[PDB]
Write a protein that holds these residues in place. Structure first.
Motif, PDB file in Angstrom:
ATOM      1  N   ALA A  73      -7.161   1.686 -18.723  1.00 46.42           N
ATOM      2  CA  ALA A  73      -6.799   1.235 -17.372  1.00 46.42           C
ATOM      3  C   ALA A  73      -5.575   2.021 -16.831  1.00 46.42           C
ATOM      4  O   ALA A  73      -4.436   1.728 -17.204  1.00 46.42           O
ATOM      5  CB  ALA A  73      -6.513  -0.281 -17.382  1.00 46.42           C
ATOM      6  N   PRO A  74      -5.823   3.077 -16.030  1.00 47.05           N
ATOM      7  CA  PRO A  74      -4.760   3.961 -15.572  1.00 47.05           C
ATOM      8  C   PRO A  74      -4.098   3.523 -14.249  1.00 47.05           C
ATOM      9  O   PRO A  74      -4.680   2.781 -13.455  1.00 47.05           O
ATOM     10  CB  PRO A  74      -5.487   5.311 -15.371  1.00 47.05           C
ATOM     11  N   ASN A  75      -2.864   3.964 -14.050  1.00 45.42           N
ATOM     12  CA  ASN A  75      -2.300   4.120 -12.716  1.00 45.42           C
ATOM     13  C   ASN A  75      -1.484   5.391 -12.637  1.00 45.42           C
ATOM     14  O   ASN A  75      -0.777   5.727 -13.589  1.00 45.42           O
ATOM     15  CB  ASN A  75      -1.398   2.942 -12.344  1.00 45.42           C
ATOM     16  N   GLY A  76      -1.569   6.070 -11.492  1.00 50.43           N
ATOM     17  CA  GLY A  76      -0.678   7.185 -11.168  1.00 50.43           C
ATOM     18  C   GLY A  76      -0.904   8.416 -12.020  1.00 50.43           C
ATOM     19  O   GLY A  76       0.042   9.164 -12.319  1.00 50.43           O
ATOM     20  N   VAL A  77      -2.138   8.590 -12.477  1.00 47.88           N
ATOM     21  CA  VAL A  77      -2.506   9.810 -13.195  1.00 47.88           C
ATOM     22  C   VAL A  77      -2.900  10.938 -12.223  1.00 47.88           C
ATOM     23  O   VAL A  77      -3.840  10.813 -11.430  1.00 47.88           O
ATOM     24  CB  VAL A  77      -3.634   9.562 -14.246  1.00 47.88           C
ATOM     25  N   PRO A 132      -0.490  -5.806  -8.997  1.00 45.88           N
ATOM     26  CA  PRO A 132       0.440  -6.214  -7.944  1.00 45.88           C
ATOM     27  C   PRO A 132      -0.049  -5.974  -6.514  1.00 45.88           C
ATOM     28  O   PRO A 132       0.614  -6.390  -5.571  1.00 45.88           O
ATOM     29  CB  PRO A 132       1.666  -5.327  -8.210  1.00 45.88           C
ATOM     30  N   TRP A 133      -1.152  -5.255  -6.340  1.00 44.67           N
ATOM     31  CA  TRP A 133      -1.538  -4.818  -4.992  1.00 44.67           C
ATOM     32  C   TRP A 133      -2.095  -5.923  -4.114  1.00 44.67           C
ATOM     33  O   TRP A 133      -2.596  -6.928  -4.620  1.00 44.67           O
ATOM     34  CB  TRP A 133      -2.529  -3.658  -5.055  1.00 44.67           C
ATOM     35  N   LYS A 134      -2.065  -5.716  -2.800  1.00 47.58           N
ATOM     36  CA  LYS A 134      -2.857  -6.554  -1.909  1.00 47.58           C
ATOM     37  C   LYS A 134      -3.893  -5.833  -1.043  1.00 47.58           C
ATOM     38  O   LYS A 134      -3.738  -4.658  -0.726  1.00 47.58           O
ATOM     39  CB  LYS A 134      -1.980  -7.484  -1.080  1.00 47.58           C
ATOM     40  N   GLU A 135      -4.984  -6.539  -0.731  1.00 48.57           N
ATOM     41  CA  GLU A 135      -6.088  -5.990   0.081  1.00 48.57           C
ATOM     42  C   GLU A 135      -6.911  -4.924  -0.654  1.00 48.57           C
ATOM     43  O   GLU A 135      -7.513  -4.055  -0.031  1.00 48.57           O
ATOM     44  CB  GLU A 135      -5.567  -5.451   1.411  1.00 48.57           C
ATOM     45  N   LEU A 136      -6.951  -5.047  -1.981  1.00 47.73           N
ATOM     46  CA  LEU A 136      -7.743  -4.210  -2.884  1.00 47.73           C
ATOM     47  C   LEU A 136      -8.742  -5.107  -3.661  1.00 47.73           C
ATOM     48  O   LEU A 136      -9.072  -4.838  -4.819  1.00 47.73           O
ATOM     49  CB  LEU A 136      -6.788  -3.554  -3.880  1.00 47.73           C
ATOM     50  N   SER A 137      -9.125  -6.235  -3.070  1.00 49.41           N
ATOM     51  CA  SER A 137      -9.728  -7.322  -3.836  1.00 49.41           C
ATOM     52  C   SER A 137     -11.083  -6.967  -4.482  1.00 49.41           C
ATOM     53  O   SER A 137     -11.340  -7.322  -5.630  1.00 49.41           O
ATOM     54  CB  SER A 137      -9.872  -8.551  -2.951  1.00 49.41           C
ATOM     55  N   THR A 138     -11.959  -6.295  -3.737  1.00 49.10           N
ATOM     56  CA  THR A 138     -13.203  -5.775  -4.313  1.00 49.10           C
ATOM     57  C   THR A 138     -12.980  -4.760  -5.426  1.00 49.10           C
ATOM     58  O   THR A 138     -13.747  -4.708  -6.378  1.00 49.10           O
ATOM     59  CB  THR A 138     -14.141  -5.159  -3.248  1.00 49.10           C
ATOM     60  N   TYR A 139     -11.894  -4.001  -5.347  1.00 43.63           N
ATOM     61  CA  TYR A 139     -11.641  -2.936  -6.318  1.00 43.63           C
ATOM     62  C   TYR A 139     -10.989  -3.452  -7.607  1.00 43.63           C
ATOM     63  O   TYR A 139     -11.451  -3.141  -8.703  1.00 43.63           O
ATOM     64  CB  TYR A 139     -10.807  -1.800  -5.695  1.00 43.63           C
ATOM     65  N   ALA A 140      -9.925  -4.238  -7.474  1.00 42.53           N
ATOM     66  CA  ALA A 140      -9.290  -4.894  -8.613  1.00 42.53           C
ATOM     67  C   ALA A 140     -10.232  -5.758  -9.443  1.00 42.53           C
ATOM     68  O   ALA A 140     -10.110  -5.792 -10.669  1.00 42.53           O
ATOM     69  CB  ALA A 140      -8.097  -5.714  -8.162  1.00 42.53           C
ATOM     70  N   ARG A 163       0.810  -1.213   0.000  1.00 44.31           N
ATOM     71  CA  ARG A 163       0.000   0.000   0.000  1.00 44.31           C
ATOM     72  C   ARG A 163       0.859   1.286   0.000  1.00 44.31           C
ATOM     73  O   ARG A 163       1.908   1.333   0.653  1.00 44.31           O
ATOM     74  CB  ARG A 163      -0.940  -0.038   1.208  1.00 44.31           C
ATOM     75  N   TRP A 164       0.457   2.267  -0.822  1.00 52.54           N
ATOM     76  CA  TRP A 164       0.815   3.704  -0.681  1.00 52.54           C
ATOM     77  C   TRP A 164       1.423   4.107   0.677  1.00 52.54           C
ATOM     78  O   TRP A 164       0.849   3.810   1.729  1.00 52.54           O
ATOM     79  CB  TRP A 164      -0.423   4.589  -0.921  1.00 52.54           C
ATOM     80  N   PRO A 165       2.519   4.888   0.648  1.00 50.92           N
ATOM     81  CA  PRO A 165       3.209   5.363   1.853  1.00 50.92           C
ATOM     82  C   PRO A 165       2.273   5.944   2.918  1.00 50.92           C
ATOM     83  O   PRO A 165       1.587   6.936   2.670  1.00 50.92           O
ATOM     84  CB  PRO A 165       4.133   6.451   1.308  1.00 50.92           C
ATOM     85  N   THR A 215     -11.324   2.527 -16.537  1.00 52.93           N
ATOM     86  CA  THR A 215     -11.268   1.509 -15.495  1.00 52.93           C
ATOM     87  C   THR A 215     -10.011   1.727 -14.625  1.00 52.93           C
ATOM     88  O   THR A 215      -9.854   2.806 -14.049  1.00 52.93           O
ATOM     89  CB  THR A 215     -11.431   0.052 -16.076  1.00 52.93           C
ATOM     90  N   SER A 216      -9.099   0.757 -14.559  1.00 52.27           N
ATOM     91  CA  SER A 216      -7.905   0.894 -13.686  1.00 52.27           C
ATOM     92  C   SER A 216      -6.839  -0.184 -13.957  1.00 52.27           C
ATOM     93  O   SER A 216      -7.165  -1.364 -14.121  1.00 52.27           O
ATOM     94  CB  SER A 216      -8.322   0.847 -12.206  1.00 52.27           C
ATOM     95  N   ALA A 217      -5.564   0.196 -13.917  1.00 54.98           N
ATOM     96  CA  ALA A 217      -4.483  -0.814 -14.002  1.00 54.98           C
ATOM     97  C   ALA A 217      -4.484  -1.813 -12.848  1.00 54.98           C
ATOM     98  O   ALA A 217      -3.706  -2.772 -12.857  1.00 54.98           O
ATOM     99  CB  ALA A 217      -3.088  -0.170 -14.159  1.00 54.98           C
TER     100      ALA A 217
END
Ligand SMILES: CCOC(=O)C[C@H](O)CC#N
Ligand SMILES: CCOC(=O)C[C@H](O)CC#N
Ligand SMILES: [Cl-]
Ligand SMILES: [Cl-]
Lengths: 249, 245, 249, 245
Positions: free
Chosen positions: C173-177, C137-145, A247-249, C130-132
């Motif tokens: 599918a963005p990240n970090g915009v 690679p994330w964890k604990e974002l399961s409903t969102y991913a 997760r984000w810092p 939508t979203s990358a």
């Protein structure tokens, strides 16, 4: 059932050979060190269930195994090369050709050498051991990630033509599989003992550990058993969830 | 802004070269036929806004463009090789090597030849034209599908290291793109004219038609424009929705 | 050409609207805050090129735009929900249904509302943002991913039936915009000013920076122009190379 | 070792339940028909090694298995819903909601209901049976393909957090798997018997046949065995090579 496993001292070699043989295949093994009879016979003595061969080249090797043992049912192409972490502009073109020779041309040559006999009896299995690097997160591994991709795409493509002949084809793409004394690609020193290496692994893999030779061997053997021929074409990502990012810092 | 497009008479060559030019790039062009001053001159007369080179291999081509136009901002490695449909046991090993050399070693060499000057200038774009045949529906296309997959993964891998130097890297993986007179890979005859081909395209692709050189060229020109560098790494599937069942 | 952009204050809203309008589309904008006439007319005043609507619900919104402006050519479904970083076992089932409602049901409802008019004239474009996170690679974002994956797969699936009617469909599918004052999903505080946030970005993205609203707007507008209808079905990974991981310790 | 297989009479149910049982798991089974003591008893007589439950919703099913057999080691969420081929503008929004509920909310709820006890025991395996229809070749299958894609991504996402607690998570995405008497999704009549279906399977799949319940069951049983936990996160494409062109 007769199996060939290549480069048996490295990477997924021993996991594959030992577990195939537990299951009851007759397992012929190739290694570069088997050039030397001193090395050959020490392996044979150390592992009396396994049959080491001296042959080095694909056509050579297939024919010897065929003559000695009757036919090749299972081909496990366990391909290695040292990874060279250079920036692109510091390679020579020849460096990629070498990498492509060892990782992509090789498995094609073994599959070319063995196919016609497998087609003729309408049975066989073919397994390439490639790498999770194929479309992965790393940088400055460009010659290595791409050659491995060529190999995984080869397996998939071969699966589609070899279905009519009842021959499943698979690709196994590992990361972080413990390789013991072998430098390809996760030797137990330093990966099992150096506190930073141990920490990097805990950071970045979902299971928080190295994968074992047994887990890889169990897979090769599951695919070769014929219990699940319908998965043909699968690239297996044998990477324990790598990569994860916190997760984000 | 200076560009290089290779094999310009085939595949995505003209699409790419002509659109880049309309956009104000100075576009150098390579092609096997430019061995022969004869053919080179005929091309330059017909296409006064394009500048065809005679140089054939990657490093001489790059050096010659650099020396006559002063730094490559844009590489479009438009790669081609004759596809021969054969079963795996009928190929010579040496046939795979040749196929890998033309489709896979070649974009590496071109990238390898241009990368250091782009890093120094902290500016550049690199585009491989590959193929939708990677992990596709075809049989007995094993050499081609795999070589093209190697090339696509190379683009993704390089994007990851070249990001730091402000250099985006892309692959474009086409199917069913009109190639005009060129046989690489969907020539107007027969794909536009033969009733039975027209119907196959109409059945197995979603838009029910062939892609155009303008569509291909428009994508290359957008990518190279500097407008959306944040896609770096992307493999674009330029296939009108193929396949459909 | 008439465009609808939803949730215009957030995420990819402003990049999309402003750049579509520079290009010459007529751009009708939806936002939740437009419930309130005070908010509506401040936006209209701030941005006289854009046409804010009050309507909130999909059928409502399409019909108002159609009546006011003649027909809908381009649909940009710019969907948002707050991400909730819980372990799976700490959600209620209702939490996922809400997430799926906002991220997956919504874009389907807008595409359902607008399709028949687009089919009838054999022209239109449809873009889901939508979203990358979709297979990430994330964890604990399961409903969102997962909800984001449902949405990207929807776009692809719709592309295949809507080809016969000359209607391209895409997913971005963005990240970090960079999202400026908006919390969805990279506001300039802290992402542009806090030294750790700035560092995390430099660590883990290939380009070593946030992506801009302009880059996202330029993409939506490229896809809507009709210059490259043949890409239909594409999921675009608009993530600046994220994630990268450094060489072995 | 205790397992739960849902909707056991359809899709990958029998494959999964029967193979797990042969392997020494105690396998509890769920199915809509077990509402009716009538049907439940008929099942238990025919299948003395399986233990069918009456419970219908996720939390009561999990609690009831936990209380009668003492902790779920293995969840196989075998999900089904009637596919209706329609164009996007002909569906009710509420039809997508229903389809998402059966194919997507349901595996979440089952995972949500079992996750904390598996984390406490630091031991468990979770398998979703989804579909190869995700990002596939079909038209007018939009609701189904997307719901199934949501379910597949959920498996991958959970694998990433549950790794730390020693709990592997998988999806299996089938096409062309024989479902016997069940209409979900390739019933023996007609797929095994009608000349025209037999030929369609033979043409568009590489192995030129249907997959079997034994193949499906063998994969579930291998995954659940503890032998290759390091695949966690994987979507297995159980489709015999479909499609081919
Ligand atoms: C460059 C880091 O190595 C890998 O990506 C994984 C390796 O190729 C296979 C294993 N284990
Ligand atoms: C949970 C972190 O957020 C993302 O993955 C990217 C975001 O959904 C879209 C952007 N920018
Ligand atoms: Cl093409
Ligand atoms: Cl199926």
């Amino acid at each position: 059932s007769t199996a060939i496993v290549t480069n048996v001292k490295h990477f997924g070699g021993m996991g594959s050979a030992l577990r195939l043989s537990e299951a009851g295949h007759t397992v012929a093994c190739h290694d570069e060190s088997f050039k030397h009879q001193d090395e050959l016979e020490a392996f044979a003595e150390t592992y009396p269930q396994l049959i080491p061969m001296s042959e080095q080249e694909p056509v050579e090797l297939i024919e010897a195994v065929t003559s000695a043992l009757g036919h090749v049912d299972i081909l496990v192409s366990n391909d290695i090369a040292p990874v060279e972490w250079r920036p692109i502009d510091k390679y020579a073109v020849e460096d990629y050709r070498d990498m492509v020779e060892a990782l992509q041309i090789k498995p094609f040559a073994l599959a070319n050498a063995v196919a016609s006999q497998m087609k003729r009896r309408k049975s066989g299995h073919i397994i390439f051991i490639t790498s999770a690097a194929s479309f992965g997160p790393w940088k400055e591994l460009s010659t290595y990630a791409s050659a491995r991709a060529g190999a995984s795409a080869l397996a998939n493509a071969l699966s589609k033509e070899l279905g009519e002949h009842n021959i499943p084809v698979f690709a196994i793409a590992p990361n972080g599989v413990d390789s013991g004394d072998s430098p390809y690609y996760y030797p137990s020193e330093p990966w099992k003992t150096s506190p930073e290496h141990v920490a990097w692994v805990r950071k970045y893999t979902a299971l928080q550990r190295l994968g074992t030779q047994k887990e890889l061997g169990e897979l090769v053997t599951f695919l070769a058993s014929g219990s699940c021929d319908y998965l043909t074409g699968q690239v297996f990502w044998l990477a324990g969830g790598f990569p994860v990012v916190e997760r984000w810092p």
